[PDB]
Enzyme design. Structure first.
Site, PDB file in Angstrom:
ATOM      1  CG  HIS A 228      -1.312  -0.648  -1.184  1.00 46.81           C
ATOM      2  ND1 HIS A 228      -1.819   0.595  -0.871  1.00 46.81           N
ATOM      3  CD2 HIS A 228      -0.409  -0.447  -2.176  1.00 46.81           C
ATOM      4  CE1 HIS A 228      -1.254   1.507  -1.643  1.00 46.81           C
ATOM      5  NE2 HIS A 228      -0.395   0.900  -2.444  1.00 46.81           N
TER       6      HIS A 228
ATOM      7  CG  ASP B  80      -4.225   0.841   1.532  1.00 44.22           C
ATOM      8  OD1 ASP B  80      -3.515  -0.032   2.063  1.00 44.22           O
ATOM      9  OD2 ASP B  80      -3.921   1.410   0.474  1.00 44.22           O
TER      10      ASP B  80
ATOM     11  CB  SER C 148       1.527   3.365  -2.489  1.00 41.54           C
ATOM     12  OG  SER C 148       0.879   3.123  -3.718  1.00 41.54           O
TER      13      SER C 148
HETATM   14  C1  CDA Z   1      -2.199  -2.366  -4.685  1.00 39.12           C
HETATM   15  C2  CDA Z   1      -3.043  -1.760  -5.736  1.00 39.12           C
HETATM   16  C3  CDA Z   1      -3.791  -2.621  -6.558  1.00 39.12           C
HETATM   17  N1  CDA Z   1      -4.547  -2.117  -7.533  1.00 39.12           N
HETATM   18  C4  CDA Z   1      -4.651  -0.782  -7.786  1.00 39.12           C
HETATM   19  N2  CDA Z   1      -5.450  -0.285  -8.787  1.00 39.12           N
HETATM   20  C5  CDA Z   1      -6.448  -1.064  -9.537  1.00 39.12           C
HETATM   21  C6  CDA Z   1      -7.851  -0.832  -9.004  1.00 39.12           C
HETATM   22  F1  CDA Z   1      -8.046   0.504  -8.985  1.00 39.12           F
HETATM   23  F2  CDA Z   1      -8.689  -1.383  -9.893  1.00 39.12           F
HETATM   24  C7  CDA Z   1      -8.099  -1.515  -7.659  1.00 39.12           C
HETATM   25  C8  CDA Z   1      -8.444  -0.761  -6.462  1.00 39.12           C
HETATM   26  C9  CDA Z   1      -8.570  -1.533  -5.250  1.00 39.12           C
HETATM   27  C10 CDA Z   1      -8.350  -2.972  -5.243  1.00 39.12           C
HETATM   28  C11 CDA Z   1      -8.014  -3.678  -6.460  1.00 39.12           C
HETATM   29  N3  CDA Z   1      -7.911  -2.912  -7.608  1.00 39.12           N
HETATM   30  C12 CDA Z   1      -3.915   0.201  -6.944  1.00 39.12           C
HETATM   31  O1  CDA Z   1      -3.986   1.417  -7.112  1.00 39.12           O
HETATM   32  N4  CDA Z   1      -3.132  -0.335  -5.944  1.00 39.12           N
HETATM   33  C13 CDA Z   1      -2.358   0.593  -5.097  1.00 39.12           C
HETATM   34  C14 CDA Z   1      -1.459   1.482  -5.940  1.00 39.12           C
HETATM   35  O2  CDA Z   1      -0.806   1.008  -6.868  1.00 39.12           O
HETATM   36  N5  CDA Z   1      -1.438   2.780  -5.547  1.00 39.12           N
HETATM   37  C15 CDA Z   1      -0.573   3.753  -6.224  1.00 39.12           C
HETATM   38  C16 CDA Z   1      -1.351   4.935  -6.753  1.00 39.12           C
HETATM   39  N6  CDA Z   1      -2.173   5.661  -5.908  1.00 39.12           N
HETATM   40  C17 CDA Z   1      -2.911   6.734  -6.384  1.00 39.12           C
HETATM   41  C18 CDA Z   1      -2.847   7.127  -7.777  1.00 39.12           C
HETATM   42  C19 CDA Z   1      -1.994   6.385  -8.671  1.00 39.12           C
HETATM   43  C20 CDA Z   1      -1.242   5.283  -8.136  1.00 39.12           C
HETATM   44  F3  CDA Z   1      -0.404   4.541  -8.860  1.00 39.12           F
END
Ligand code: CDA
Lengths: 26, 11, 250
Positions: free
Chosen positions: C43, C99, C197
């Site tokens: 991602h 991922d 990430s």
């Molecule tokens: C790309 C992305 C999109 N949506 C995220 N969170 C929202 C969600 F949890 F609802 C989710 C999970 C999987 C697919 C779509 N939405 C997410 O966490 N990332 C990855 C991300 O931003 N990882 C960073 C991260 N990793 C672990 C803890 C906190 C944190 F910010």
């Protein structure tokens, strides 16, 4: 040679919190 | 606020 | 990293920074698994929902760093990418299942006191260490709260039981993920956050004293929220693909 840090394992020195990890592997 | 890295890498 | 602390020099020699050329900025964390390969979260490179789709020439890999923003002359090494490999079954449409991504460097990087590869777990190491209650370590230059650290941050977190992981979210969890973090009643806290990430979740084997990367910082809902946990890509579960790529293109 992977996983052995030059500044720690290679010198037989431990970082300040690795002990916490090891202690959790009860 | 990143410090300019050498152009030799950005080329 | 939220509620973490400053890392010591050379504490995580496998830590890698994914750096964007234009504009110059921190994209994600990553890890060095050999002199020519870097492991990160898919991602970090591809995520259509946010119009994210980085190619080889869009990024730079910075190895051996400590400070987040400064160019650490004579210490860090910057490398270009030859090719990027994203898992063919990476599910960006639903839950970020699988991922994971591999990056082939233009030229092998030379190891040093600040640059050293981490080990990939074998079946036995994974079986004996990937257990609820056991603690791993996460590192990164990501945000300190859901602002930014001066140097690499570190935090040790316990692995959490699958049931608890499942019951903390509405997202469909797969066998290719595991979650970690403290429970709201355990007192202590900590978690990864934006910018972290692709970073490594590692554990030290009490059998041979080596460090192994068991997970990749993948996703979460907020950062260090009570009752929520960080989710990581299960590296061993996907090692077949990792090995396939390396000995077929390396
Ligand atoms: C790309 C992305 C999109 N949506 C995220 N969170 C929202 C969600 F949890 F609802 C989710 C999970 C999987 C697919 C779509 N939405 C997410 O966490 N990332 C990855 C991300 O931003 N990882 C960073 C991260 N990793 C672990 C803890 C906190 C944190 F910010």
């Amino acid at each position: 040679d992977c996983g052995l840090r030059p500044l720690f394992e290679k010198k037989s020195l431990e970082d300040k919190t690795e002990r916490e990890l090891l202690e959790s592997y009860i | 606020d990143f410090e300019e890295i050498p152009e030799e890498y950005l080329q | 990293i939220v509620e973490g602390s400053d890392a010591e020099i050379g504490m995580s020699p496998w830590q890698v920074m994914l750096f964007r050329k234009s504009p110059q900025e921190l994209l994600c964390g990553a890890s060095l698994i050999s002199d020519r390969w870097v492991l990160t979260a898919a991602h970090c490179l591809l995520y259509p929902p946010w119009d994210k789709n980085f190619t080889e020439n869009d990024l730079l890999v910075r190895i051996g760093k400590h400070s987040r923003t400064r160019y650490e002359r004579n210490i860090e090494k910057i490398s270009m990418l030859e090719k990027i490999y994203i898992h063919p079954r990476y599910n960006w449409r639903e839950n970020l299942d699988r991922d994971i991504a591999l990056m082939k460097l233009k030229k092998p990087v030379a190891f040093s006191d600040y640059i050293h590869p981490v080990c990939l777990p074998d079946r036995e190491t994974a079986a004996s260490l990937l257990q609820a209650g056991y603690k791993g370590r996460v590192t990164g230059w990501g945000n300190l709260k859901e602002g930014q650290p001066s140097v690499l941050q570190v935090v040790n977190l316990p692995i959490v039981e699958r049931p608890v992981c499942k019951d903390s979210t509405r997202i469909r969890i797969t066998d290719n993920m595991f979650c970690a973090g403290y429970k709201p009643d355990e007192g202590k806290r900590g978690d990864a956050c934006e910018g972290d990430s692709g970073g490594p979740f590692v554990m030290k084997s009490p059998f041979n004293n080596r460090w192994y990367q068991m997970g990749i910082v993948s996703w979460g809902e907020g950062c260090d929220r009570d009752g929520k946990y960080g989710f990581y890509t299960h590296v061993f579960r996907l090692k077949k693909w990792i090995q396939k790529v390396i000995d077929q293109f390396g």
